[PDB]
């Protein structure tokens, strides 16, 4: 589980988004596993605007922060899960790391701020849904 709180936006995994997130929907993209919803309160998370390929992510199934190398966001084939059929997920960054289903929402951070959230796992790899291309998260 997990979210980014930037401005009056909540960024979650589309597959973990609640009634209220859907009731307050701003933008959603099945192919990226992202849902942004509106919030009353103002968030403090700064989104990274950069091309960093190193970072730390939080893994609830280990209660551990792991430094990682990750790929640039790409169209990555992701096996069938309890939430999506086997398909290509867009804007996905892979690293060598531990990621179970309930690790989704774990933040990946570089020195610039939030890079994205855990979205995929399996085969000793963790997938991060990039949010750094979403410029509008920082305004309006
Ligand atoms: N590379 C880097 C530099 C500075 C901070 C940073 O934050 C890591 C982190 C903090 C809290 C939750 C999850 C991850 C990563
Ligand atoms: Zn960065």
Curated annotation (Swiss-Prot):
Substrates-to-products reaction catalysed: Selective cleavage of Tyr-|-Gly bond in the picornavirus polyprotein
Top-level lineage group: Viruses
Coiled coil start-end: none
Catalytic site positions: 15, 33, 104
UniProt: Zn(2+) 1 binding residues: 50, 52, 110, 112
Functional note: Cysteine protease that cleaves viral polyprotein and specific host proteins. It is responsible for the autocatalytic cleavage between the P1 and P2 regions, which is the first cleavage occurring in the polyprotein. Also cleaves the host translation initiation factor EIF4G1, in order to shut down the capped cellular mRNA translation. Inhibits the host nucleus-cytoplasm protein and RNA trafficking by cleaving host members of the nuclear pores. Counteracts stress granule formation probably by antagonizing its assembly or promoting its dissassembly.
Assembly behavior: Homodimer.
Protein name, UniProt field: Protease 2A
Originating organism: Coxsackievirus A16 (strain G-10)
Residues of the full protein shown: 869 to 1008 of 2193
């Amino acid at each position: 589980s997990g979210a980014i709180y930037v401005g009056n936006y909540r960024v979650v995994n589309r597959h973990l988004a609640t009634h209220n997130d859907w009731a307050n929907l701003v933008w959603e993209d099945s192919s990226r596993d992202l849902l942004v919803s509106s919030t009353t309160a103002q968030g403090c998370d700064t989104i990274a605007r950069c091309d960093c390929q190193t970072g730390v992510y939080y893994c609830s199934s280990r209660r551990k922060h792991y430094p990682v190398s990750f790929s640039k966001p790409s169209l990555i084939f992701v096996e069938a899960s309890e939430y999506y059929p086997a398909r290509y997920q867009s804007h996905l960054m892979l690293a060598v790391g531990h990621s179970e289903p309930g690790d989704c929402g774990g933040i990946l951070r570089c020195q610039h701020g939030v890079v994205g959230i855990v979205s995929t796992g399996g085969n000793g790899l963790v997938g991060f849904a990039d949010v750094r291309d979403l410029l509008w998260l920082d305004e309006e």
